Structures are given as C-alpha cells and as structure tokens.
C-alpha cells in the first residue's frame, strides 16, 4: 500500500499567524529563518503511531476580498484547522461568526479543530498592555474549550510558531481527527 494523503485546510482571520505556523512546522524552521517562498501550500510527513502520513496543508487567504474563491478548495477536505489568535479577541469572534459557519455549510460532516495561535504573546508586556487599554485579556485555554464543544469542534489546541510549543501536537490531533 502506498502512503495516504490527508488534505487539511487552514482557515481563520488574516494576521492570526496561519502561514507562519504552516511554514514553520513543515520546513522545520523557526519563523526568523524562513527562506521566503513565492508558492502557497505545504506538505509534511508526520508519524502517527507507527505509520507515516503525508499531510497536505492548504493555506487560505482570510480577507473578504477572497470570500468568493476561498471555498473552491473546500471540496475533498478531510479535516479543517480553524485558527484564531489568543491575543486577538476579534480573531476569536470570527471563529463563531464567520469561520465555523462558513465551513460547516459546504462540508457539513467534515471534522474541524479549534486552533489558537501566538500563545507566547500571552507573556508579552506590550501586547498585554494593548489588550488592557481596550479592557481585554488574552483568550485562556478553558474559555476556548467552551467555544470548541459549543461549536462542536473535535477539540481545541494551541501553539506558538515562535517558541514552537504545541506545534507538534496541533498537526498530530489534526491527523487524528481527519482519521
């Protein structure tokens, strides 16, 4: 038997760190030393209990100017990664308002996960201060657990591309849910 190829699709607001985590995990690089690429999308082989899987990572533009074309890549998806920044409250809001609704439509039974990003920013003075000045705290794990089950995600996971904590787990669970 030849290796199985799990189509995974990443969706979430622009600037939540979508492309950053994809490139980071798949090139085995820290953000700071990406050799820039003109091409989109990413392929990575992951080891899930004995077996090698080739994970196909489809990167989507999160802006409205692309609302119409984005879903063209939604047919065939085996699992969805819905991203939001744990330090961008609007990010979180789009999850419930725009994102999981957008996908649940086309791929009704397709499983998705709740991915929260940039969690290393939780320990950042500048960012924290920015939040306070609008009367806000970064999304916390548990609150994100809630959203998850409510909206019926397989589960919720979080990571930092920058410190690469949680990074492996994210794409693991991604493969588990797609299976």
């Amino acid at each position: 038997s030849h290796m199985q190829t799990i189509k995974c699709v990443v969706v979430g607001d622009g600037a939540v760190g979508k492309t950053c985590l994809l490139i980071s995990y798949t090139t085995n690089k820290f953000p700071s030393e990406y050799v820039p690429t003109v091409f989109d999308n990413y392929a990575v082989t992951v080891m899930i209990g004995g077996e090698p899987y080739t994970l196909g990572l489809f990167d989507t533009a999160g802006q409205e100017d692309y609302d119409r074309l984005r879903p063209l890549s939604y047919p065939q998806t085996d699992v969805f990664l819905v991203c939001f920044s744990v330090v961008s409250p609007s990010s979180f809001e789009n999850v419930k308002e725009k994102w999981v609704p957008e996908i649940t439509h086309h791929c009704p039974k397709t499983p998705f996960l709740l991915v929260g990003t940039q969690i290393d920013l939780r320990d950042d003075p500048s960012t924290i201060e920015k939040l306070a000045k609008n009367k806000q705290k970064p999304i916390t794990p548990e609150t994100a657990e809630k959203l998850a089950r409510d909206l019926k995600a397989v589960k919720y996971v979080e990571c930092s591309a920058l410190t690469q904590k949680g990074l492996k787990n994210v794409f693991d669970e991604a493969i588990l849910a797609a299976l």
Binding site: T5, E33, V38, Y66, Q164, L167
Partner: protein
C-alpha cells in the same frame, strides 16, 4: 586486552542504545565489535578477512586499528539481527557473506536455510519500503552549546545529532530544554532560534545557550551518482546542509539572498553514538536571481515527478498545483518574472528556460487533474485552469513569446 576493553565498551554502549531504542547505533556497535574480533582472528590465521569487509558496512571501522571462530560466528549472527532491527536490510548480506563459507564447510544446512530465509525477507522488505516509504531512518540536527559557566568543555562545541524517525525541530528543541533545565535549573537554560554563525561576543554569560538547526544529508554531483537509492543517501553520511535567508534577514525577491552551509562530521552516520562532532564547515552564498532560478527549478521537478507517476496522488497534486497557479497568500512565481525578466545577467538563459518548463508543468498538471476530479470540484479545476492560462499570458507578455 584493549580489544577486550573496546569490546566491553561497545557491548554496553549497545545495551544502552537498545534500551533507548536507537537500533542503528546498536547495530554499528555490533559491527565494530565483530570487525575487531575478525581482524584479530585474521592476524592469527583463523579467519580470512578482518576490518575491511566491514568497511563497506561502515567507513568508521577504520577507527579500530578469548576470541575464536565460534565467537566470531555468534557475533556475525548478532550483527545480522542487529541490522534487521535497525531496518538497514541492504546491509545484511555483507555480514552473511562472511559466515556462509563457514557454515558450508561445517555442512550446517539448517543455519544456511535460516540465513537465506532472512536475506529473502530482507530483500523483500527493501522493495516494500522503497515503494511504501515507511522506512524512517532518522532526522539530523546541528546542535551547539554556549556558556562556559554551565557547559564548560562543551562550550562552543557543535554536533550533528541523529534523531528517531521523523523527529521535528520543535520536538528535539523541547527535549533539550527539559534535559538541560532539569540539569542546570529551569530559568538558566535559553534557546537560540537563529541559524547564523553566532559569536559569544554577545551572549549573557549568565545563561546556558543551546542552538538547534535542522540539517539534511548533503552530496555533490559525483556522490548523487554513486548513491542512486534513498537508502544509499541515508547510510554512511558525513556531510549535512542547511540554507539560511539573508540580505546584503528575509526581504523581497529583488534582494533575497541565501547561504548554503555544508557541515562535515568527524565520523559518518550511522555510528556507535547518536551525536558526532562537526569537523569542518563552509558555505556558499546565492544571489536573489540564483535563488529565484533554484526555487523555480525545484517546483517544476516537484510537479513533473507528481505528474509522471503511476500511483498518482490527487491531493498532493492539487496542493502543489494550486500553490503554483491559484496563489492567494504569498507573492506568486510572477514576482520573479516581474523583478527579473523585464527590460541583469545573460545567465537568465536559465531563469527563462525554467519558466518555459514551468508552464509546461502546470499544463500537464491541469491535464492530469482534469482526469481525477469527481465533478464536485470541476469548477475548482476551472479557476485553476483559468489562472494558469491567465498568468500564462502574463509570462508570455513579459518574455515576448508563447505560453
């Protein structure tokens, strides 16, 4: 005896490796022990080879510059079984060839049956995994330690680390934190996430620094021709490579340079240890256009290999093709043509050629995909097909030719 000491050392190193699950390093220990016994027995006129029939299995044998036939025989069977467990099937015959004539002379047909059973299975596994890609021989990393205060004699030293299966950068990183935080206290260990040659001339002498860079096996054109299989490119490897973005860090295409660093370890992998000091290193810088050219080349070959296949992968084909013509997030291969292929350097005979081969590739890609879509896409293939043609015009436009 020193051969007896060396043996003792290798045999315990082996039980440790076995415990840790580092089977190839255990196997190498068996081979080194076996090569030692063989060399000695060869000098005594009991065996006919020694060290050098083992040099094919590993060049590191050169480092080994009571015992009798029966011991040798038992060690050889040990190496064979070692190599089976390491999944280095291709290498088992090198060992058994040494013991076959002994079994024949002893008329040990049961043993011969067994060994040839193993070789049959081994060569059977080989075609399997050459096709199923399920043999995962390891990932490699440049690791460097900084901080006389906590590392001492280890300060400044760079190693290649060989890690299990598909060990990600993210995973070995952590593991070295948890390791050196549990040894030098939590808040005392810092990680350098930058691949540049670092000077201690700006490190806080208070902390232990660890730098971890992913690297891959490197080969020149002659080596790529001697090593035709993936296995040959994963065995007896001494040189590793990584590429680093720089500007004269990461900029726009017009200015994007790349540094390719080749690291040479003092011994090859696999070895009796899973980390090996770097012996030597050097680098090669690439211009933004060289970069472009190189980047473009890798994509067309990427597509061709996908197209020209029997076990065609629809998902992995769309992924590569969509990210080729239906580019949403990043710049787009056109950025190379706009910034480089307008109206310099006559080596552009390369940059153009590749763009000629590029369109031909997406076309064949579209073509192939045309025949895979379960209709539910179909429209999706049209936009792609539409984008292909669209950009095809753009390139033709700037290059003043067809597409």
């Amino acid at each position: 005896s020193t051969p007896e000491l060396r043996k003792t050392w290798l045999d315990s190193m082996a039980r440790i490796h076995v415990k840790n699950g580092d089977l190839s390093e255990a196997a190498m220990c068996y081979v080194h022990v076996t090569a030692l016994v063989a060399e000695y027995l060869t000098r005594k006129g009991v065996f006919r080879q020694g060290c050098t029939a083992f040099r094919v299995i590993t060049p590191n044998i050169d480092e080994e510059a009571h015992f009798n036939e029966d011991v040798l025989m038992e060690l050889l069977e040990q190496c064979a079984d070692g190599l089976w467990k390491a999944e280095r099937y291709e290498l088992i015959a090198d060992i058994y060839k040494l013991i076959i004539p002994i079994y024949e002379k002893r008329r040990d047909f049961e043993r011969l049956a067994h060994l040839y059973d193993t070789l049959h299975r081994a060569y059977s596994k080989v075609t399997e995994v050459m096709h199923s890609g399920r043999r995962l021989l390891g990932t490699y990393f440049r690791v460097a330690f900084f901080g006389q205060g906590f590392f001492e004699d280890e300060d400044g030293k760079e190693y290649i680390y060989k890690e299990p299966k598909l060990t990600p950068l993210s995973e070995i990183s952590q593991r070295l934190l948890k390791l050196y935080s549990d040894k030098f206290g939590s808040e005392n260990v810092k990680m350098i996430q930058d691949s540049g040659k670092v000077n201690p001339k700006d490190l806080d002498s208070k902390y232990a620094y660890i730098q971890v860079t992913h690297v891959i096996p490197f080969f020149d054109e002659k080596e790529l021709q001697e090593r035709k299989t993936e296995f040959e490119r994963s065995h007896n490897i001494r040189r590793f490579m990584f590429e680093m973005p720089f500007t004269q860090r990461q900029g726009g295409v017009e200015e994007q340079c790349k540094r390719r660093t080749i690291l040479t370890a003092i011994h090859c992998f696999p070895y009796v240890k899973k980390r090996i000091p770097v012996m030597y290193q050097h680098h090669t810088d690439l211009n933004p256009i060289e970069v472009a050219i190189d980047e473009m080349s890798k994509k067309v070959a990427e597509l061709r290999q996908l197209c020209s296949s029997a076990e065609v992968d629809m998902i992995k084909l769309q992924l590569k093709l969509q990210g080729s013509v239906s580019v949403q997030v990043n710049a787009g291969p056109l950025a190379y043509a706009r910034a480089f292929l307008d109206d310099p350097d006559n080596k552009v005979k390369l940059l153009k050629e590749v763009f000629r081969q590029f369109v031909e590739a997406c076309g064949q890609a579209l073509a192939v995909n045309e025949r895979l879509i379960k209709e539910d896409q179909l429209e999706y293939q049209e936009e792609m097909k539409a984008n292909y043609r669209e950009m095809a015009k753009e390139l033709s436009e700037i290059m003043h030719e067809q597409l």
